[PDB]
């Protein structure tokens, strides 16, 4: 949600730019400041604690009368900012890229989960110093790779095939920006290797997404991995994928919606996304999300019964 | 599991019999006693605390080196024994019925749940003094009525139709005899009124037993209510309904297996019970419980999709 | 240990005497008083809290610089004093018996255990009002009865025959005068009915006193019940039974040592007590307590092996 | 109980094999995997946390619906695996021994007790680096030595002679695989030096195994040390020594049952083991374990009386 | 310190006056009120909680910015007010005495200690209903009696003669108005019966006031009992007895200073009080309190040595 | 109380002896051992934990059935043993001194207080490495110096003159061997510099030992410092100084009783010690300790009055 500027600021090192985090006490001194409408876009200078983000980012931090910001007063904020800076310092920035590299939108939950991944002494982001850089660059947005299992967000593995991996997103026990709804449950399926999947494996995946998580729809936000989210939410997700697609007339990213395997996606979401990709307006697209239909929406018929009978014995 | 003798003893009151509970300290004094094999079947007399159950009930109480008994040292034991005695004192017993009324098998969990029901100041067993007597007599076994909603065991209502009621059995947080497996989940469906159910109501029940609890099979132990238990258990239940049916060559109860509505019972369990009722041996009956089949096992096709589409909006 | 005067005082009610307890705050005011050696034997009058025991009982209560008294500041002291008074008020005392009824020696632990017995809603001292009077009169010393099971001290039944009963003395968790040694373990065997015991029962008792408690000697202090105490203590007990026997030249009690069944008592203690009863001096008696001997000290040979073989299967 | 493969896996280092432990998070990812019945015997590869034991070891780890595995999620699992690997890395393995060195059966409790021994800064396994290697190799099974006091399992010394040592096994307060029965008590006697014991020392041992632990039988599982276990268990031990002896037709170990000193072993167990060693079937062997007999089963008569008389004074 | 009006208000009952306490919530509503300087002396009427003391008593209750008031929000305030009202309701008041009976000065600590005395089920103020009335009337000031032991303030008896009684004032653990100095220790000696004391008793008192409390001076504030207070305070007491004596030109009480036994009072305080009683000014009186002198200030010489020698043995 | 052998053992290092402490687990293994009466005086060898003190020191350690030993299982035991060894390693011992250097009697409380002194980062035993050696050698007994302030035991300074220093002994909050009596209070006065004290300083000391601690007698055990202990104890101290003096016919120490300044010592103790030094028997010496007398026992008369008058102002 938040931009990259809320976490770090650029400091020109006479060849290229360095990036330095903020202090929570420098932000706290900015929420109380009184600056005029000529200096909202320039970084603030709290004499005692250093530089602070510009004042226009007021309503992005958890003040007294605010709850839609992030808990910047936490030990996790510093870790996430150090992660972002360590990533951006490797990637050399130029004098004409700074304004377009600190203005990108990132998911703070993704970054916090990467932090949690890199501190597990038995992970592989804890040993491999290059995999962590690749993961962080993918999360930031300055990379052209696809999020696979080895650089995925993280969570808790609840199913592992020879080609897929299901993670359970632990967004309730976060600190920097936890989910406030106490009824949140969500999963995601990431591919192990970017390559054509076989047919015996898609069946082992769908025979588990139908028996265990049957109250959950399989959708995708465009990139190369599926998201498992309950039906009573599929509405709000549609109104959130259409915005981003429509908010991409600002050409800084080419909106290349990667419609994944149709034998796995919910047929209604496949229809809606195919329409939205072909260039149809909103209200004619969401019409395809609420339309009842049962024409051939079961590729692999005779799956749940097999699981029942294998469970009995 | 335990008999009725473990909870109370008969005391002849010169017209008919009275029934009096035991003391936990009188039982504790019996587990340590040393009686010879002529007096195992006669009640014990612990000089200080009164009468105690016969010594042959040694391995029915939670000693130091035992865990398949009941926690008689608890405040719930006294409540359950008082309940049993208050029920049996109403029903007048004769000098030739005592040996056949304290030798019946009861479910201690059923009695404990009745106790929990009668102490809820907003129940109806808390006001109506006759409904509690009917419920307790049904639980004991000295009644010819069917367990309906108004005299059911109890638990926590998770679904209520116009004709059915689903209860969630809280067997883990019991005291007298809790379930030791920490993965126990089980439900039961009881009818509201003993009368023919309509067809629009069976559909509202099956449209909920297929969407929410899809990993659970619908079985029945013979009486007039369904039990919802997970598939990985349907084996052990079959080996437990066949014993009781086979252990009814001792004619004190006429084994009248009430096969309930076939549109609700799992078809495999319906076949197995119909066979066992027709008088076939065990191994040819359980053969019908593991046989894979999908010939017309969906009376109401097109139900889960309706629930999906009603959930989306 | 303490006398009966430490718990109650006599108040003349113009026909016979009444007995009234003390106040702990009246005793506390006496430990600080300053009385001259003419009024040590007369009751004290603490103006604010009433009468207090005579000052000569100074070193009988737990002061700051004392630990061989009793915890009179406890709720148990009041209960024990009320028990003693309720017993002595029934037994009518005369103007020439008061000085010889408050000068008797009692075991405070016995009285506290009686108190604990009478408050157990499932005892029989809790119902029968006459059994409690008999028990308390036996404990005080104004009765000519023998302590049987039904009026015994109390504890925790660890074995119950058809003729005997073993109790485990809980002297560590007392309040009025607990045992300070944290390695104290002791039992006592009381007879159920005062009558000749059979022979099949003495064998069931000795087959348990040899298998379970083999590190414990069976002794007796004179009255009609056995005491099971470990060998490393049998010395101090001998020096305590000989004193009481020798301190009975003051004829207020006829020392009638009831040597119990020789097939149960430790042969050394039987010899020592028989000698002391015949009128031999101390050092020639205790000579029989340390003399090694194995001439026919096993009446029932072949007992422990039977228990081993019954335990194996 | 568990094999050596559950703790470590071999990694070929181009001269011989290295051995590396597992990660608990790599095992947790294997219990959820879905592998086909061609790859059950090959190590698993959980992309994120590394290698994991083969899937055929499913029911060897404490899952949700399991309790007969080990608590692999504990800090003790890692210590035990590091111990096993440090032992096996010293002993050079060859390309034709790996399949027969990770398939051996070990006692996890033995290994955990060795771990507890090596971290006591005042032990000798804490200083001597070679004694720890000898102890661990004895525990694993790749050594031809006998477990003496200096390389024993461990516990708490409750008796120490000039030739023997009694340890009290603390199996209830373990973490990797504690005993679940809360009535477990067991001891073991190990020899100090492998050499002929004198006669004045066997008497000091038997005079303590008869006075203190009289409810305990002295048995042996074949190796060079005695085990003190209560009689109500001697049945289950017999059915467990006979299996291992009978399961040694697979010649990888020569079953050399070292019947220890007959003056110490329970005569029934000596007879049973001598029979089973001579090659008699089970039911004729266990016949000698339940047969009552008292022909000359007391070599040193007049021992307990000496202890009584030494305790009195 | 506080007046009697702070605790109760008069309500005319058409024959004489009744007295009713206040509510703490009615006082809290008065501290916030805004009354003009015509109604400071008339009782306040907080519409919701009733009558409240006049506003001129503002700085007599513990507000936020105050600590020299009393903790009126405590359960002790209500008890003390009920005590005062129960006393004043017995004593019939007339239409020309109300203004002079609620304007008296009382010691709140005295009243709180009386409350503590009357709730001790083993006191005598707990039984005798007339002694409590006498005590409370003495404390208030509407009685012509002398505070003896049986109606004394209270505390903890630390010494009791045949004629005196020493109490230890527990002013630190009060609630209504505790002493804030955490180094406060003070005693008082009250006479048992108002009658001439013997000579053997004054010696037993002075032989204890010289050995135990030697750092404490014996003074008196005028009434019939001694106060034991440490020397570093005898200054402030002198400046407090002289005020009250000088503030008695307002003749509502006849200042009759009862100089007690000169063999007990500190000679300097005896001289100072005799002077102040004869009618000398302050600075010439306090001159006699700091003058060093040792002419015959030991009536009973040879006392501490006797106590030493009695302590040795 | 304990000897030096209970803390360390000698190990011959081929030139002179080294000294090494014990392990608590090596002592625990010795209390359970079974050694014959030829090897009681030779060090024990617990195979697992090393050397252990000889078995004749059984009743010197806190077992289960013992309380007159020391808490060897504490972290303080190791510190005290390390202190003793570090002291004895400096002082070179010879092959004919070991038996007479580990047989000396030391006060364990003194050593524990030295340990507490050396770990205070603001002491001087924490900086000066030679003062700690001098202090420890004085405590052990291998030095010919007098305990002055700079090498004193320790405690809490409650008075400091220009020539004396009073310490308050904190023996209740020790760990290795605390005082069990909860009414223990004791002080000691040590000289600052070994040199003749003036006369204006002895007066400042006695004017404080008479005002504050008047219930305490000033005694001395022979060395160069006074001990302040309450009168009710002066008996037991006399029976303890006479033993040591009489137990010095074993000439390993020349009993040189240093009778200190007579103007400070209690005159009775001065008389008793002078007698015992002149060579009179016990019962004629203790006669001088209980004799009442007041002939010129006040050198500085007119001291307490000065303190009163200085306290008033």
What single string gives the DSSP state of each residue in chain E?
--BSTTTEEEEE-SSSEEEEE--HHHHHHHHT----TTSSSSPEEETTTEEE--GGGGGGB--TT--SSB-TTSHHHHHHHHHHHHHHHHS---TTTHHHHSS-B--HHHHHHHHHHHT-TTSSTTT-HHHHHHHHHHHHT-------GGG-----EEEE-SSEEEEE---TT-SSS----TT--EEEEEESSSS---SHHHHHHHHHHTTT-TTEEEE--SSSEEEEEEGGGHHHHHHHHHHHHHTT-STTS--------TTTS-HHHHHHHHHHHHT--HHHHGGGTS----SS--SS-S-HHHHHHHHH-
Residue in C214, C231, C311 closest to D312 by CB:
C231
Inter-chain CB proximity B232 and A311 less than 8 Å: yes
One domain, residues A266 and A198: yes
Count: domains in chain E = 2
Mutate to test the interface with C, among B23, B34, B45, B51 (most CBs of C within 10 A): B34
Looking at residue C232, the DSSP 8-state letter turns out to be: G
Residues of chain B with Cβ-Cβ distance to D215 below 8 Å are: none
Classify C16 in phi/psi space as left (phi over 0), alpha (psi -120 to 50) or beta: beta
Cβ–Cβ < 8 Å for D218, D234: no
One domain, residues F92 and F136: yes
One domain, residues F126 and F226: no
Q: In whole angstroms, what is the distance from residue C191 CA to residue C264 CA? A: 13
Alpha-carbon separation of residue D115 from A7, A55, D118 (angstroms) = 46, 59, 5
Write down the residue that tokens 């009357």 correspond to.
E118
Residue in F23, F25, F32 closest to D160 by CB:
F32
| Max Cα distance, chain D (Å) | 74
Sign of dihedral through CA atoms F84, F85, F91, F97?
positive
One domain, residues F283 and F213: yes
Quick one: which of F212, F265, F264, F205 has its CA closest to F241? F265
Q: Which two structure tokens, joined as six digits, stand for C242?
A: 């000989």
Counting CB pairs under 8 A, whether chains E and A reach 3 or more, is no
* E124 among annotated binding-site residues: no
Which of D118, D145, D172 is the last residue in one of the domains? D145
Looking at residue D262, the DSSP 8-state letter turns out to be: T
Closest chain D residue by Cα to residue A131: D48
Kindly provide the b/e burial profile for residues A123-132, where b requires at least 16 CB atoms within 10 angstroms of the residue's own CB: bbbeeeeebb
One domain, residues A163 and A303: yes
- Taking the alpha carbons at both ends of chain A, their separation in whole angstroms is 48
Cβ–Cβ < 8 Å for F222, F229: no
Counting CB pairs under 8 A, whether chains A and F reach 3 or more, is no
Q: In whole angstroms, what is the distance from residue F296 CA to residue A231 CA? A: 105
Cross-strand partners of C10: C19
Inter-chain CB proximity F29 and D124 less than 8 Å: no
One domain, residues F16 and F139: yes
**Interchain CB contacts (distance < 8 Å): A and B:** 45
Inter-chain CB proximity D48 and A204 less than 8 Å: no
Those chains having 3 or more beta-carbon pairs within 8 angstroms of chain F are C, D, E
Inter-chain CB proximity B34 and C160 less than 8 Å: yes
Sign of dihedral through CA atoms C55, C59, C65, C66?
negative
Inter-chain CB proximity B292 and A311 less than 8 Å: no
CB atoms within 10 A of CB C91: 16
Gap from E306 CA to chain F (nearest CA, Å):
8
Looking at residue C43, the DSSP 8-state letter turns out to be: P
Quick one: which of F145, F243, F250, F163 has its CA closest to F202? F163
Gap from A117 CA to chain B (nearest CA, Å):
30
Question: What crossing angle do the helices spanning B267-278 and B234-246 adopt, rounded to 10°?
Answer: 20
Q: Which two structure tokens, joined as six digits, stand for B275?
A: 């066979």
Residue in F34, F47, F49 closest to D122 by CB:
F49
Cβ–Cβ < 8 Å for B6, C131: no
| DSSP SS3 for D113 | helix
Inter-chain CB proximity D160 and F28 less than 8 Å: no
- Can you spell out the DSSP letters for A196-219? ---SHHHHHHHHHHTTT-TTEEEE
Gap from D230 CA to chain B (nearest CA, Å):
14
B236 φ, ψ (degrees, to nearest 5): -60, -30
Cross-strand partners of B27: none
Chain D positions contacting chain B at CB under 8 Å are: 64-65, 183
Counting CB pairs under 8 A, whether chains F and E reach 3 or more, is yes
Those chains having 3 or more beta-carbon pairs within 8 angstroms of chain E are C, F
Looking at residue A23, the DSSP 8-state letter turns out to be: -
Cross-strand partners of F10: F19
Q: In whole angstroms, what is the distance from residue C79 CA to residue C85 CA? A: 10
Neighbouring C-alpha atoms within 13 Å toward the C-beta of B108 = 25
Inter-chain CB proximity D34 and A204 less than 8 Å: yes
Chain C positions contacting chain F at CB under 8 Å are: 64-65, 183
Q: In whole angstroms, what is the distance from residue A52 CA to residue A72 CA? A: 12
Q: In whole angstroms, what is the distance from residue E229 CA to residue E168 CA? A: 11
Q: In whole angstroms, what is the distance from residue B164 CA to residue B202 CA? A: 9
Q: In whole angstroms, what is the distance from residue D45 CA to residue F188 CA? A: 74
Residue in F294, F305, F312 closest to E235 by CB:
F312
Chain C positions contacting chain D at CB under 8 Å are: 211-212, 214-215, 217, 231-232, 234-235, 289-290, 292, 294, 302, 304-306, 308-309, 311-313
Counting CB pairs under 8 A, whether chains C and E reach 3 or more, is yes
Gap from F79 CA to chain D (nearest CA, Å):
15
Q: Which two structure tokens, joined as six digits, stand for B117?
A: 């029901």
D21 φ, ψ (degrees, to nearest 5): -70, -175
The range of the structural domain enclosing residue E226 comes to 152-312
Q: In whole angstroms, what is the distance from residue E95 CA to residue B1 CA? A: 83
One domain, residues C218 and C299: yes
One domain, residues F16 and F133: yes
Sign of dihedral through CA atoms A30, A35, A37, A42?
negative
Any idea of the CA torsion for E184, E189, E192, E197, to the nearest 10 degrees? 180
Residues of chain F with Cβ-Cβ distance to E304 below 8 Å are: 214
Classify B218 in phi/psi space as left (phi over 0), alpha (psi -120 to 50) or beta: beta
Cβ–Cβ < 8 Å for B235, A312: yes
From the number of C-beta atoms within 10 Å of its C-beta (0-12, 13-18, 19+), residue C273 rates as: buried
Cross-strand partners of B168: B187
Q: In whole angstroms, what is the distance from residue B255 CA to residue B234 CA? A: 21
Gap from F42 CA to chain D (nearest CA, Å):
14
Kindly provide the b/e burial profile for residues E215-229, where b requires at least 16 CB atoms within 10 angstroms of the residue's own CB: bbbbbbebeebbbbb
Residue in C35, C47, C50 closest to E149 by CB:
C47
Residue in D231, D232, D311 closest to C231 by CB:
D311
Quick one: which of E105, E179, E127, E186 has its CA closest to E153? E186
Computed on alpha carbons and rounded to an integer, the radius of gyration of chain E in Å comes to: 22
Cβ–Cβ < 8 Å for B139, B162: no
Counting CB pairs under 8 A, whether chains A and D reach 3 or more, is yes
- Known catalytic residue: C174? no
| DSSP SS3 for C209 | helix
F130 Cβ neighbours under 8 A, 6+ residues apart = none
Which of C112, C145, C178 is the last residue in one of the domains? C145
One domain, residues F159 and F308: yes
Inter-chain CB proximity D28 and A122 less than 8 Å: no
- Can you spell out the DSSP letters for A61-130? B--TT--SSB-TTSHHHHHHHHHHHHHHHHS---TTTHHHHSS-B--HHHHHHHHHHHT-TTSSTTT-HH
One domain, residues C229 and C107: no
Three-state SS annotation for chain B: CCECCCCEEEEECCCCEEEEECCHHHHHHHHCECCCCCCCCCCEEECCCEEECCHHHHHHECCCCCCCCECCCCHHHHHHHHHHHHHHHHCCCCCCCHHHHCCCECCHHHHHHHHHHHCCCCCCCCCCHHHHHHHHHHHHCCCCCCCCHHHCCCCCEEEECCCEEEEECCCCCCCCCCCCCCCCCEEEEEECCCCCCCCHHHHHHHHHHCCCCCCEEEECCCCCEEEEEEHHHHHHHHHHHHHHHHCCCCCCCCCCCCCCCCCCCCHHHHHHHHHHHHCCCHHHHHHHCCCCCCCCCCCCCCCHHHHHHHHHC
Which of F129, F145, F161 is the last residue in one of the domains? F145
Chain C positions contacting chain E at CB under 8 Å are: 23-26, 28-29, 32-35, 46-50
One domain, residues F188 and F292: yes
Q: Which two structure tokens, joined as six digits, stand for B168?
A: 């969630």
Alpha-carbon separation of residue B162 from B191, C296, E88, E111 (angstroms) = 9, 85, 70, 69
Q: In whole angstroms, what is the distance from residue B225 CA to residue B191 CA? A: 7
| DSSP SS3 for D58 | helix
F271 Cβ neighbours under 8 A, 6+ residues apart = F288, F289
Inter-chain CB proximity A150 and D34 less than 8 Å: no
Looking at residue D256, the DSSP 8-state letter turns out to be: -
Sign of dihedral through CA atoms A127, A129, A134, A138?
positive
- Can you spell out the DSSP letters for D114-154? HHHHHT-TTSSTTT-HHHHHHHHHHHHT-------GGG---
Residues of chain F with Cβ-Cβ distance to E234 below 8 Å are: 312
Residues of chain C with Cβ-Cβ distance to E159 below 8 Å are: 32-34
CA angle (F22 as vertex; F17, F28 as ends), nearest 5: 150
Cross-strand partners of C44: C52
Cβ–Cβ < 8 Å for D96, D110: no
Closest chain D residue by Cα to residue C236: D312
Q: In whole angstroms, what is the distance from residue E67 CA to residue E177 CA? A: 10
Residue in B217, B290, B305 closest to A292 by CB:
B305
Chain E positions contacting chain F at CB under 8 Å are: 211-212, 214-215, 217, 231-232, 234-235, 289-290, 292, 294, 302, 304-306, 308-309, 311-313
| DSSP SS3 for F91 | coil
Mutate to test the interface with D, among F47, F51, F63, F77 (most CBs of D within 10 A): F47
Quick one: which of B197, B203, B226, B189 has its CA closest to B304? B203
Residue in D123, D159, D208 closest to F49 by CB:
D123
Looking at residue A304, the DSSP 8-state letter turns out to be: H
- Can you spell out the DSSP letters for E56-68? GGGGGB--TT--S
- Can you spell out the DSSP letters for D65-86? T--SSB-TTSHHHHHHHHHHHH
Any idea of the CA torsion for D267, D268, D270, D276, to the nearest 10 degrees? 160
Inter-chain CB proximity E305 and F289 less than 8 Å: no
Inter-chain CB proximity D48 and A124 less than 8 Å: yes
Candidate list B11, B174, B201, B225, residue with the active-site label? B225
One domain, residues E299 and E223: yes
D242 φ, ψ (degrees, to nearest 5): -70, -35
Q: Which helix or strand (DSSP H or E) is residue C29 part of?
A: helix C24-31
Q: In whole angstroms, what is the distance from residue F187 CA to residue F157 CA? A: 10
Any idea of the CA torsion for A87, A92, A97, A100, to the nearest 10 degrees? -10
Inter-chain CB proximity C123 and B48 less than 8 Å: yes
Q: In whole angstroms, what is the distance from residue A243 CA to residue F126 CA? A: 72
């Amino acid at each position: 949600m938040a931009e990259l500027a809320c976490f770090c600021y650029p400091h020109l090192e006479n060849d290229s730019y360095k990036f330095i985090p903020f202090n929570n006490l420098a932000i706290k001194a900015m929420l109380t400041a009184k600056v005029d409408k000529k200096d909202m876009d320039k970084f603030y200078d709290s004499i005692i604690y250093g530089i602070a983000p510009p004042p226009q980012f007021k309503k992005r931090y958890n003040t007294n009368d605010n709850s839609r910001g992030m808990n910047f007063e936490t030990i996790m904020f510093t870790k996430v900012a150090m992660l972002i800076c360590e990533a951006l310092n490797s990637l050399k920035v130029t004098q004409a890229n700074v304004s377009n590299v600190l203005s990108r939108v990132v998911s703070i939950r993704h970054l916090e989960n990467l932090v949690i991944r890199k501190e597990n002494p038995q992970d592989i982001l804890f040993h491999s110093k290059d995999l962590l850089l690749k993961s962080t660059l993918i999360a930031i947005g300055q990379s052209k790779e696809i999020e696979t299992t080895i650089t995925a967000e993280g969570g808790e593995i609840v199913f592992q095939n020879a080609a897929f991996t299901m993670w359970k997103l632990t967004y309730l026990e976060h600190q920097l920006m936890p989910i406030l709804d106490q009824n949140f449950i969500e999963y995601k399926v990431t591919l192990n290797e970017d390559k054509p999947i076989s047919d015996v494996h898609v069946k082992e995946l769908v025979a588990e997404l139908r028996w265990q998580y049957n109250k959950f729809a399989v959708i995708t936000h465009g990139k190369g991995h599926y998201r498992i989210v309950k039906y009573s939410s599929v509405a709000n997700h549609a109104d959130r994928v259409y915005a981003t697609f429509k908010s991409n007339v600002k050409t800084g990213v080419n909106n290349d919606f990667n419609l994944l395997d149709q034998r796995i996606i919910w047929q209604n979401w496949y229809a809606f996304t195919s329409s939205m990709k072909q260039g149809n307006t909103l209200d004619v697209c969401k019409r395809l999300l609420f339309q009842k239909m049962k024409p051939e929406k079961n590729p692999f018929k005779g799956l749940s019964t097999d699981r029942k009978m294998d469970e009995v014995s």
